[PDB]
Design a protein around this nucleic acid. Sequence first.
RNA 1: GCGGGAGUAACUAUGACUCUCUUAAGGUAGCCAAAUGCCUCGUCAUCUAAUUAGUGACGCGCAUGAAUGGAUUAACGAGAU
RNA 2: GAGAAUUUGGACAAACUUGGUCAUUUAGAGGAACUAAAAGUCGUAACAAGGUUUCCGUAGGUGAACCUGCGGAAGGAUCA
RNA 3: GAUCGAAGAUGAUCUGGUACCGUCGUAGUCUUAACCAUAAACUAUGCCGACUAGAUCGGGUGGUGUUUUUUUAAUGACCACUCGGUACCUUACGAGAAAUCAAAGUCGGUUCUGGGGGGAGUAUGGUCGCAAGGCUGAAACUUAAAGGAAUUGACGGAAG
RNA 4: UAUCUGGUUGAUCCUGCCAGUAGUCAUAUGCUUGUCUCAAAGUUAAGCCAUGCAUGUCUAAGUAUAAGCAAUUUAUACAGUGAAACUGCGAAUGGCUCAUUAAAUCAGUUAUGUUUAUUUGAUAGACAUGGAUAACCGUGGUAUUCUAGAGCUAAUACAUGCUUAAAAUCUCGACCCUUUGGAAGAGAUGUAUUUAUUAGAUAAAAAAUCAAUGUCUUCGGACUCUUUGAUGAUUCAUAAUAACUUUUCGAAUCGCAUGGCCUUGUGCUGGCGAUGGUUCAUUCAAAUUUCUGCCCUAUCAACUUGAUGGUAGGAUAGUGGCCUACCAUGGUUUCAACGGGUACGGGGAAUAAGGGUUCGAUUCCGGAGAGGGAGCCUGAGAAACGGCUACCACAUCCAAGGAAGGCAGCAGGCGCGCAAAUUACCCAAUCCUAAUUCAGGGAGGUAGUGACAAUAAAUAACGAUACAGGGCCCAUUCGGGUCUUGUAAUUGGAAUGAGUACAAUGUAAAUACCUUAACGAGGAACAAUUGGAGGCAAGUCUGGUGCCAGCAGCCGCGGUAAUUCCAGCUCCAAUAGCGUAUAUUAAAGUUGUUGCAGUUAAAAAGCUCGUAGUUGACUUUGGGCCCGGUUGGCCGGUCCGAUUUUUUCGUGUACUGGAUUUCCAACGGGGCCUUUCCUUCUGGCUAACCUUGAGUCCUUGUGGCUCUUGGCGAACCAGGACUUUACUUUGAAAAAAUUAGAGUGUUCAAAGCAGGCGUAUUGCUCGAAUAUAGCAUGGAAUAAUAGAAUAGGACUUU
Lengths: 118, 80
Amino acid sequence: NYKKRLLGTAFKSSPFGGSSHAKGIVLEKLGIESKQPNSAIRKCVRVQLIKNGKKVTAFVPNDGCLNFVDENDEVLLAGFGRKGKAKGDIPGVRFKVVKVSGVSLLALWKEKKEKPRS
Amino acid sequence: RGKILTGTVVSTKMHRTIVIRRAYLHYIPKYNRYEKRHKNVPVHVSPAFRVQVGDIVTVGQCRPISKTVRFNVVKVSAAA
RNA sequence: GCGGGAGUAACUAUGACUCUCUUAAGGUAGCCAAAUGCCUCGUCAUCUAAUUAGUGACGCGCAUGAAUGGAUUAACGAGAU
RNA sequence: GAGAAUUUGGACAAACUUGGUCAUUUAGAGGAACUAAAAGUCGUAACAAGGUUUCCGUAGGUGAACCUGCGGAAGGAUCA
RNA sequence: GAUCGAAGAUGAUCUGGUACCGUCGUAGUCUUAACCAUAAACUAUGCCGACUAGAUCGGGUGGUGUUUUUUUAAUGACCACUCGGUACCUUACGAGAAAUCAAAGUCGGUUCUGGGGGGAGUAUGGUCGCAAGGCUGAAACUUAAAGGAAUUGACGGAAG
RNA sequence: UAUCUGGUUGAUCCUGCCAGUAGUCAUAUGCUUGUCUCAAAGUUAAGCCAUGCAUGUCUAAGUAUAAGCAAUUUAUACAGUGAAACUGCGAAUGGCUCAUUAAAUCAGUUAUGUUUAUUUGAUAGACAUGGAUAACCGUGGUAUUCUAGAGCUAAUACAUGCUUAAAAUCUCGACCCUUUGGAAGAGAUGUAUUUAUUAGAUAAAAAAUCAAUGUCUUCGGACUCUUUGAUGAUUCAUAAUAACUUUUCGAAUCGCAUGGCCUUGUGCUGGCGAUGGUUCAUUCAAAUUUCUGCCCUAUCAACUUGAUGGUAGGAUAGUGGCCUACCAUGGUUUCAACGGGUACGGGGAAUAAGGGUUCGAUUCCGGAGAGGGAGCCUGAGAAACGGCUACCACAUCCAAGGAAGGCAGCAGGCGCGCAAAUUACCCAAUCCUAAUUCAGGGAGGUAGUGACAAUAAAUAACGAUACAGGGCCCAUUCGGGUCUUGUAAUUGGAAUGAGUACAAUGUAAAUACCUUAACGAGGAACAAUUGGAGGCAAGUCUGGUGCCAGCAGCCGCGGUAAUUCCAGCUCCAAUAGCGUAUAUUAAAGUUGUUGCAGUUAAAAAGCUCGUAGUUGACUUUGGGCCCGGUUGGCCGGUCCGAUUUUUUCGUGUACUGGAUUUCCAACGGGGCCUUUCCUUCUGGCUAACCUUGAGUCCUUGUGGCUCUUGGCGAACCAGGACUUUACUUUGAAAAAAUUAGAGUGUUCAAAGCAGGCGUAUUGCUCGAAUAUAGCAUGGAAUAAUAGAAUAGGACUUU
């Protein structure tokens, strides 16, 4: 048949499959800086997946600066940057870390605050 | 099947049976331009053998005297 | 025929660039530990019962450099691992 | 006359082993390039006619953005 | 190989001047044969056919009147048209984001081509070439815009 | 039938990408967590699997444990004319999975050369005999699997056809015959189940019809082939034609209930039910095959010898390269072969206004697979998940000799992962399997688990009274009316969901029981949270922190007065859901078929030329070919009956709507294809048009007038019928008016109407098939001759 060569829409995500989230055993906990318009050291982790086996960097927001996501943490990894564009301040991250989840539930939640959860 | 289609002879050597090429005029659904097909249809003549190569012959169903050769040709029209 | 001494970039670490001395005046395209390397079992990957060859680079160039020429690049041998 | 077992011969299907050839993936000496990122080095190339009008193609040469030969365009006003 | 000159060699200019400028000068520039085949190769507007007001150059015809002029061929002068090319100018209807166009308005038959910027006309393979190189031709990744039409004002070793 | 907003700027309008608003998902994660009905619940390793279970059933198939014989067990009124054992029938059904498969798969529509346990309809036959054999008993070999010698015994298991008292009648053929009959054999047994003709084709044995010998005869007639085949004929089947479609084949077996007469070697016969071997049907199911349509990649272009096909045998249930030998050299392909990569396919499911785009879960239909690879048997059906044998790898048992295994069946274990449920209950109901009773079913019918989703109740709402404040209508200004962010030990209460006791009800093997009313008690609409507040996007103020702590989908905010961080109070929106994440579609006219641009934004190839391909000015026509409908076949709703019902089920008919997109047929097209003329002295000779248009009649629909509404005249639309003037080649005419003659397709079968007759038959119409300027050539008429067919007559040693 006829058509010009159309490419289907591609999410800029190195994990694939048909899965929302993913487990990952982690290497290190980093604290990287950012691009031009904003300062502050923003926290990240080097998540290596089990099923897919890809190296990704993920932003860990939390009300805990040195919150527990260590070297060998079984952390759950979601989207945010898969959904929408990738983040402006600290580029490279396009994955956000989920709280208290997975099989083992090692990575902790937002602490020192007593507004409703999230 | 029914109706008498076209069929010009391609292969002629042997006794009784030949091969014909048929052509059709089908629409390709998204184009809406016409196309044309090829099909190898083996077809039985007679123990007399009256066809040449080129002959437009009247096709129709008859006995499977071979499993693939269900067609017979009765009336030869052209000669080459 | 084709240079020395001195000072200098966040931070381990380096010298872009700048000054000064000296002489007639101080080198490009491209490549490197050599039929040439004091220093050197240098430094790293792969191979090997050990394996420095096979083959993968490192940069720590005693002392690479366009016509008695760099460089593109197929065929052929009682010549070399 | 029959059944079991043994031997010889014919034909069929597929596996296993060895060698050659092609594609893909991983490890990898080694080699070339890009993107992002503060400060630097050297020149003022581009930007007003930026004080030699620029840019693109192509060829040669230089520490360096570059300079020069040749052609053309308006991406200099106006239909050059 | 006459006339001018990339590269190359001296003089000058400048903070520097591997340039502009001036003195010289090699390959080129010219020629035959063969090759590579590109240009901001241009009307930046594909080809072919029919509908819709207004120049100039070439052909053919007319001007019972006037002029040229002594082989009078004036081919002319100057005017009417009728056809093709149509430097083009100018403009109503109409269209468009607008400048503008006068079809780049608007229509068909057929063919080519586009789907954000950078990465890229690159990487790699195929194919062609004697070689420089041509033709075909992506992705990872990066980014949130690149771009067109039109305005105001400052400035000029711009003009009045 | 479709509504866009924000972000490129100093501002504006285009171009254009991105981000967001919506609907959806077997869902996953954070958070909160109060119920129910219905539905759904391994997407990753078709990876490896422990243990229990998923496949049985009849005693109504038999001997028949009496008469005679060991031991043990069960039942009784007494007899137990006893059973649980050994045999036979199913395991190919059903359930699970998508590895594989661009396929002769599958999907539309069809076609022929077969098979088919069981079921179902009909005829005749069903006789007469023989030998073994488990179970069982006494013993014996092994760890187990597996069994060895020996004795007794039944059958519908198995194998012969030996015997012939008695034995009718008919038909057919050999031997033998004075041809009259005789001996011997095989078949048949009242009434019933599509044809004719022709062409091509296989095999063992027997037979019909005949050719090729021969003989006897009162010469009338009658006999007669080891073997071989058919010029011809017969029989089964197919094709073609006269109307079509579907279905259809090969060697005995008896047991049981009841009973009168008769016979009996004491086992017949009669009646009735049921089974088995044959013969021919029928139903249901499976094979095999023709044609059309198929995904991407041409940075995959050459591929193909058992390959295309014929010839013969060989093989098969059958068509067949299914297979081989020999021969020819073809077949496929740019209309995309072949290769590589990817993938089960359809009914359908989601989204959309539709077009389309993206998918192929559950359900249902078809195919393919059972640790890996191979082969076979058994059987009607298997080259077989719970069948068998050899081999290999794994894990397991073992006396070390050797054995036993395969969860892509259910529940569950381990590993993989974002992640997905009990080692539950049961044969009641439906359905399948076995004369019925009745038994089996991890099929199925149910239960348990989880906001997984939809749905409803929904996140709560009433009659009456007291008091305080601000706004508006009216006001006689005194008050009165309407109306609710607070408040009160306010008062009267009413109300679900659930538990518990008692009564009442239906199915049960089990878990949890339903419904109404009275009385008492407890709890209470079974604790409300989540998200947002700068613009897009409803909604702001005050403190605290100070580029830190932090938030971020986009553009951005935080370094001292932050509506963006953080907490409060203060607001908005929805709610048992709320937000995030996944991914598809819409937004997107951004791959444009419906429905897109190219002077300057991205975009006309440097220019000519030309092949394949695509497209086509034009007169008159029917046929042929092709494209496109509209109508009928299946399903749903409505109609009808039962019923409380618009639930739901069943049947018949009509209407309407939707779907599979392929065949047949009718009716009007569009596109595609076809000539003045034509032997010659000579005369020039012979013949003609589709249709359009107009008129008339009838029928239908609309509008006007009129009727409570149902009638009437005219115009116009559409359909059907009727209708000639007309057209043409020629002659006679002084010319010419005019006139005279002829023509306006053919053939066949049936059905209707139409002259004269009972009919026949002719004409016309309706429907099909076939063809659409003549004089070289071909057909018919006419004549001759040769062959064949058909009919009639004269003859015949026919």
